[PDB]
Amino acid sequence: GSDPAFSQPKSVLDAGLTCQGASPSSVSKPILLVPGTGTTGPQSFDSNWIPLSAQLGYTPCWISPPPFMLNDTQVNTEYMVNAITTLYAGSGNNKLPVLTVCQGGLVAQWGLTFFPSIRSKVDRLMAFAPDYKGTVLAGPLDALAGSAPSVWQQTTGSALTTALRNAGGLTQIVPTTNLYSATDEIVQPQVSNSPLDSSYLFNGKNVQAQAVCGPLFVIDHAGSLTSQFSYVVGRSALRSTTGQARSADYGITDCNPLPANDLTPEQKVAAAALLAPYYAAIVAGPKQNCEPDLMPYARPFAVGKRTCSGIVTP
Ligand code: NI
Protein backbone atom coordinates (compact mmCIF):
# COMPACT_ATOMS: atom_id res chain seq x y z
CA GLY A 1 0.00 0.00 0.00
CA SER A 2 2.74 2.43 -1.09
CA ASP A 3 2.98 6.15 -0.45
CA PRO A 4 1.89 8.54 -3.20
CA ALA A 5 4.86 9.77 -5.18
CA PHE A 6 6.58 13.04 -4.37
CA SER A 7 6.19 15.80 -6.91
CA GLN A 8 9.60 17.07 -5.75
CA PRO A 9 13.02 15.38 -6.08
CA LYS A 10 14.21 14.04 -2.72
CA SER A 11 17.33 16.20 -2.77
CA VAL A 12 15.18 19.33 -2.86
CA LEU A 13 13.26 18.09 0.18
CA ASP A 14 16.51 17.21 1.94
CA ALA A 15 17.72 20.82 1.49
CA GLY A 16 14.94 22.05 3.79
CA LEU A 17 15.81 19.90 6.85
CA THR A 18 18.26 21.03 9.56
CA CYS A 19 19.15 19.59 12.98
CA GLN A 20 20.84 21.90 15.47
CA GLY A 21 24.15 20.40 16.49
CA ALA A 22 23.75 17.06 14.73
CA SER A 23 23.26 15.47 11.36
CA PRO A 24 19.72 14.38 10.42
CA SER A 25 21.20 11.11 9.16
CA SER A 26 22.50 10.31 12.67
CA VAL A 27 20.80 12.01 15.62
CA SER A 28 19.59 11.05 19.09
CA LYS A 29 16.26 12.27 20.46
CA PRO A 30 15.25 14.46 17.51
CA ILE A 31 12.16 16.63 17.39
CA LEU A 32 10.69 17.97 14.13
CA LEU A 33 9.58 21.62 14.12
CA VAL A 34 7.26 22.69 11.28
CA PRO A 35 6.87 26.50 10.94
CA GLY A 36 3.86 28.64 10.12
CA THR A 37 2.77 30.57 7.04
CA GLY A 38 5.22 33.28 6.00
CA THR A 39 8.09 31.94 8.14
CA THR A 40 11.10 29.69 8.16
CA GLY A 41 11.89 27.20 10.91
CA PRO A 42 14.17 29.59 12.80
CA GLN A 43 11.87 32.59 12.32
CA SER A 44 9.12 30.56 14.00
CA PHE A 45 11.06 28.82 16.78
CA ASP A 46 14.26 30.86 17.31
CA SER A 47 13.00 32.49 20.52
CA ASN A 48 10.94 29.61 21.90
CA TRP A 49 10.89 25.88 21.18
CA ILE A 50 14.35 25.48 19.64
CA PRO A 51 16.08 26.52 22.90
CA LEU A 52 13.24 25.08 25.04
CA SER A 53 13.23 21.60 23.54
CA ALA A 54 17.02 21.49 23.80
CA GLN A 55 16.75 21.88 27.57
CA LEU A 56 14.19 19.06 27.70
CA GLY A 57 16.80 16.72 26.20
CA TYR A 58 15.92 16.79 22.49
CA THR A 59 17.96 17.64 19.42
CA PRO A 60 16.00 20.46 17.77
CA CYS A 61 15.36 19.88 14.07
CA TRP A 62 13.15 21.81 11.65
CA ILE A 63 12.08 22.21 8.05
CA SER A 64 11.97 25.47 6.12
CA PRO A 65 9.89 24.89 2.95
CA PRO A 66 10.68 27.63 0.39
CA PRO A 67 9.59 30.32 0.04
CA PHE A 68 8.53 30.89 3.67
CA MET A 69 5.75 28.27 3.50
CA LEU A 70 3.89 30.35 0.87
CA ASN A 71 3.98 27.66 -1.81
CA ASP A 72 1.39 24.89 -2.25
CA THR A 73 0.59 23.22 1.06
CA GLN A 74 0.77 19.77 -0.54
CA VAL A 75 4.37 20.52 -1.49
CA ASN A 76 5.23 21.83 1.98
CA THR A 77 3.92 18.45 3.12
CA GLU A 78 6.53 16.63 1.05
CA TYR A 79 9.27 18.36 3.03
CA MET A 80 7.77 17.07 6.28
CA VAL A 81 7.19 13.47 5.16
CA ASN A 82 10.75 13.37 3.87
CA ALA A 83 11.95 14.88 7.16
CA ILE A 84 10.28 12.33 9.40
CA THR A 85 11.43 9.45 7.19
CA THR A 86 14.96 10.80 7.50
CA LEU A 87 14.89 11.56 11.24
CA TYR A 88 13.18 8.29 12.16
CA ALA A 89 15.87 6.22 10.48
CA GLY A 90 18.44 8.81 11.59
CA SER A 91 17.64 7.93 15.20
CA GLY A 92 17.79 4.21 14.46
CA ASN A 93 14.12 3.62 13.52
CA ASN A 94 12.61 5.26 16.59
CA LYS A 95 9.48 7.39 16.61
CA LEU A 96 9.98 11.11 17.13
CA PRO A 97 7.76 13.97 18.29
CA VAL A 98 6.62 16.64 15.85
CA LEU A 99 5.81 20.19 16.98
CA THR A 100 4.12 22.68 14.65
CA VAL A 101 2.51 26.11 14.41
CA CYS A 102 -0.23 27.46 12.08
CA GLN A 103 -0.01 25.81 8.61
CA GLY A 104 2.57 23.44 10.13
CA GLY A 105 -0.22 21.61 11.92
CA LEU A 106 -2.20 21.45 8.67
CA VAL A 107 0.95 20.15 6.94
CA ALA A 108 1.55 17.55 9.67
CA GLN A 109 -2.04 16.27 9.45
CA TRP A 110 -2.03 16.26 5.64
CA GLY A 111 1.07 14.09 5.61
CA LEU A 112 -0.28 11.70 8.23
CA THR A 113 -3.51 11.37 6.24
CA PHE A 114 -2.14 10.73 2.74
CA PHE A 115 1.34 9.26 3.36
CA PRO A 116 0.74 6.13 5.46
CA SER A 117 4.43 5.27 5.77
CA ILE A 118 5.01 7.99 8.36
CA ARG A 119 2.00 7.22 10.59
CA SER A 120 4.05 4.83 12.75
CA LYS A 121 7.13 7.07 12.72
CA VAL A 122 5.68 10.11 14.52
CA ASP A 123 5.59 9.40 18.25
CA ARG A 124 3.16 12.26 18.97
CA LEU A 125 2.10 15.60 17.53
CA MET A 126 2.02 18.88 19.48
CA ALA A 127 0.34 21.58 17.37
CA PHE A 128 0.07 25.24 18.38
CA ALA A 129 -2.76 27.15 16.68
CA PRO A 130 -3.21 24.70 13.77
CA ASP A 131 -5.73 25.69 11.10
CA TYR A 132 -7.06 22.32 9.98
CA LYS A 133 -10.20 24.03 8.62
CA GLY A 134 -8.26 27.07 7.44
CA THR A 135 -9.31 30.56 8.48
CA VAL A 136 -12.15 32.87 7.57
CA LEU A 137 -9.95 35.96 7.95
CA ALA A 138 -8.25 35.05 4.64
CA GLY A 139 -11.03 36.71 2.62
CA PRO A 140 -13.38 35.16 0.07
CA LEU A 141 -11.95 32.75 -2.52
CA ASP A 142 -13.12 35.17 -5.25
CA ALA A 143 -10.83 38.04 -4.17
CA LEU A 144 -7.47 36.27 -3.78
CA ALA A 145 -6.31 36.50 -7.42
CA GLY A 146 -2.56 36.89 -7.02
CA SER A 147 -2.32 35.71 -3.41
CA ALA A 148 0.00 32.91 -2.41
CA PRO A 149 -0.95 29.27 -3.09
CA SER A 150 -1.13 28.34 0.62
CA VAL A 151 -3.29 31.40 1.33
CA TRP A 152 -5.78 30.06 -1.23
CA GLN A 153 -5.69 26.65 0.41
CA GLN A 154 -6.15 27.86 4.00
CA THR A 155 -9.26 29.86 3.09
CA THR A 156 -12.36 28.37 4.67
CA GLY A 157 -14.19 26.26 2.11
CA SER A 158 -11.07 25.54 0.05
CA ALA A 159 -10.73 22.30 -1.86
CA LEU A 160 -7.73 21.42 0.30
CA THR A 161 -9.53 21.72 3.64
CA THR A 162 -12.51 19.97 2.08
CA ALA A 163 -10.40 16.99 0.96
CA LEU A 164 -8.59 16.67 4.29
CA ARG A 165 -11.98 16.62 6.02
CA ASN A 166 -13.62 14.03 3.77
CA ALA A 167 -10.54 11.76 3.87
CA GLY A 168 -10.94 11.42 7.64
CA GLY A 169 -8.11 13.88 8.35
CA LEU A 170 -9.92 15.77 11.13
CA THR A 171 -9.42 12.73 13.40
CA GLN A 172 -6.19 12.31 15.33
CA ILE A 173 -3.94 9.81 13.57
CA VAL A 174 -1.08 9.80 16.11
CA PRO A 175 -1.45 11.06 19.73
CA THR A 176 -2.10 14.77 19.24
CA THR A 177 -2.35 17.84 21.46
CA ASN A 178 -3.74 21.05 19.98
CA LEU A 179 -3.30 24.27 21.97
CA TYR A 180 -5.15 27.28 20.57
CA SER A 181 -6.92 30.48 21.57
CA ALA A 182 -10.35 31.93 20.95
CA THR A 183 -8.60 35.32 20.68
CA ASP A 184 -6.45 34.13 17.78
CA GLU A 185 -6.35 37.11 15.44
CA ILE A 186 -5.13 35.00 12.48
CA VAL A 187 -7.08 31.73 12.70
CA GLN A 188 -10.87 31.96 13.14
CA PRO A 189 -13.26 30.63 14.20
CA GLN A 190 -11.66 29.43 17.44
CA VAL A 191 -14.32 30.39 19.98
CA SER A 192 -16.52 27.33 20.36
CA ASN A 193 -14.17 24.96 22.22
CA SER A 194 -15.74 22.32 19.99
CA PRO A 195 -15.32 20.56 16.61
CA LEU A 196 -16.35 23.87 15.00
CA ASP A 197 -12.89 25.27 15.75
CA SER A 198 -10.22 25.13 13.08
CA SER A 199 -7.74 23.67 15.60
CA TYR A 200 -10.01 20.85 16.79
CA LEU A 201 -9.14 17.22 15.99
CA PHE A 202 -11.48 14.38 16.85
CA ASN A 203 -10.01 12.17 19.64
CA GLY A 204 -7.15 14.59 20.20
CA LYS A 205 -6.31 16.55 23.34
CA ASN A 206 -7.86 19.84 22.25
CA VAL A 207 -6.77 22.62 24.61
CA GLN A 208 -8.50 25.95 23.98
CA ALA A 209 -6.77 28.45 26.26
CA GLN A 210 -10.02 30.06 27.41
CA ALA A 211 -11.47 26.70 28.48
CA VAL A 212 -8.68 26.30 31.04
CA CYS A 213 -7.83 29.88 31.93
CA GLY A 214 -11.25 31.50 31.69
CA PRO A 215 -13.12 33.53 29.08
CA LEU A 216 -11.28 36.73 30.00
CA PHE A 217 -7.93 35.06 29.24
CA VAL A 218 -6.33 36.81 26.26
CA ILE A 219 -3.66 35.16 24.15
CA ASP A 220 -2.91 35.90 20.52
CA HIS A 221 -1.64 33.84 17.58
CA ALA A 222 2.05 34.21 18.45
CA GLY A 223 1.39 33.88 22.18
CA SER A 224 -0.20 30.52 21.43
CA LEU A 225 3.31 29.28 20.61
CA THR A 226 5.54 31.08 23.15
CA SER A 227 3.46 31.59 26.31
CA GLN A 228 4.44 29.98 29.60
CA PHE A 229 1.07 28.22 29.50
CA SER A 230 2.03 26.87 26.08
CA TYR A 231 5.37 25.66 27.42
CA VAL A 232 3.82 23.79 30.34
CA VAL A 233 1.22 22.20 28.06
CA GLY A 234 3.81 21.45 25.39
CA ARG A 235 6.11 19.90 27.96
CA SER A 236 3.30 17.71 29.30
CA ALA A 237 2.58 16.38 25.81
CA LEU A 238 6.23 15.46 25.19
CA ARG A 239 6.81 13.74 28.55
CA SER A 240 3.37 12.06 28.71
CA THR A 241 3.19 8.29 28.70
CA THR A 242 -0.06 8.64 26.70
CA GLY A 243 1.50 10.91 24.05
CA GLN A 244 -1.05 13.66 24.82
CA ALA A 245 -0.89 16.49 27.33
CA ARG A 246 -2.34 15.36 30.68
CA SER A 247 -4.86 17.53 32.51
CA ALA A 248 -3.11 16.69 35.79
CA ASP A 249 0.22 18.10 34.56
CA TYR A 250 -0.93 21.58 33.60
CA GLY A 251 -3.71 23.46 35.35
CA ILE A 252 -4.64 26.95 36.45
CA THR A 253 -1.23 27.24 38.12
CA ASP A 254 0.08 27.73 34.60
CA CYS A 255 -2.24 30.36 33.08
CA ASN A 256 0.49 32.86 32.16
CA PRO A 257 0.38 34.32 28.62
CA LEU A 258 3.90 35.72 28.60
CA PRO A 259 7.04 34.11 27.10
CA ALA A 260 8.06 30.86 28.74
CA ASN A 261 9.72 31.17 32.13
CA ASP A 262 12.69 28.94 31.27
CA LEU A 263 13.60 31.25 28.40
CA THR A 264 16.49 33.66 28.83
CA PRO A 265 15.79 37.41 29.17
CA GLU A 266 17.04 37.95 25.60
CA GLN A 267 14.85 35.06 24.36
CA LYS A 268 11.87 36.38 26.39
CA VAL A 269 12.06 39.79 24.66
CA ALA A 270 12.25 38.25 21.17
CA ALA A 271 9.30 35.97 21.91
CA ALA A 272 7.18 38.90 23.19
CA ALA A 273 7.66 40.79 19.90
CA LEU A 274 7.34 37.88 17.45
CA LEU A 275 5.85 39.26 14.20
CA ALA A 276 6.20 36.00 12.24
CA PRO A 277 2.35 35.74 11.97
CA TYR A 278 2.45 38.95 9.85
CA TYR A 279 5.91 38.43 8.26
CA ALA A 280 4.32 37.37 4.97
CA ALA A 281 2.94 40.86 4.29
CA ILE A 282 6.46 41.94 3.24
CA VAL A 283 7.77 38.72 1.67
CA ALA A 284 7.28 38.16 -2.05
CA GLY A 285 5.59 34.85 -2.78
CA PRO A 286 4.30 32.89 -5.75
CA LYS A 287 1.38 34.15 -7.79
CA GLN A 288 -1.83 32.12 -7.95
CA ASN A 289 -5.08 32.90 -9.80
CA CYS A 290 -7.10 29.80 -8.74
CA GLU A 291 -6.90 27.30 -5.93
CA PRO A 292 -4.07 24.88 -6.74
CA ASP A 293 -5.15 21.54 -8.11
CA LEU A 294 -5.27 18.70 -5.62
CA MET A 295 -2.73 15.93 -6.00
CA PRO A 296 -4.38 12.81 -7.49
CA TYR A 297 -4.43 11.11 -4.09
CA ALA A 298 -6.72 13.81 -2.65
CA ARG A 299 -8.87 14.71 -5.68
CA PRO A 300 -11.66 12.16 -4.96
CA PHE A 301 -12.33 13.67 -1.52
CA ALA A 302 -13.24 17.15 -2.75
CA VAL A 303 -15.57 16.37 -5.68
CA GLY A 304 -17.54 19.45 -6.66
CA LYS A 305 -14.91 21.91 -5.49
CA ARG A 306 -13.33 24.47 -7.82
CA THR A 307 -9.61 24.43 -8.57
CA CYS A 308 -7.39 25.51 -11.45
CA SER A 309 -8.41 22.62 -13.71
CA GLY A 310 -12.10 23.22 -13.09
CA ILE A 311 -14.68 21.66 -10.84
CA VAL A 312 -13.15 18.46 -9.43
CA THR A 313 -14.86 15.21 -10.47
CA PRO A 314 -14.46 11.50 -9.81
NI1 NI B 1 0.80 31.79 11.69
Author numbering: 4 to 317
Lines quoted from the article behind this entry:
Here, we choose lipase B from Candida antarctica (CALB), as the model enzyme, in which Asp187-His224-Ser105 is the catalytically active triad.
An extremely high catalytic efficiency was observed for the purified variant QW4 (kcat/Km = 5920 s−1M−1), with kcat increased by 6 folds and catalytic efficiency (kcat/Km) increased by 40 folds compared with WT. While the helixes of QW10 and WT CALB are well superimposable, the helix section P280-Y282 of QW4 is deformed and shifted toward the active site, with an additional H-bond between Y281 and E188 formed. The interactions with Y281 and E188 in QW4 further positions the substrate in the catalytic pocket of the enzyme. However, optimization of the point which is closest to a transition state corresponding to the concerted mechanism always led to the Cys105−/His224+ zwitterioinic pair, indicating the concerted mechanism is not preferred for variant QW4. The high catalytic efficiency of QW4 is attributed to its optimal binding properties, as well as the relatively low reaction barrier in the rate-determining step.
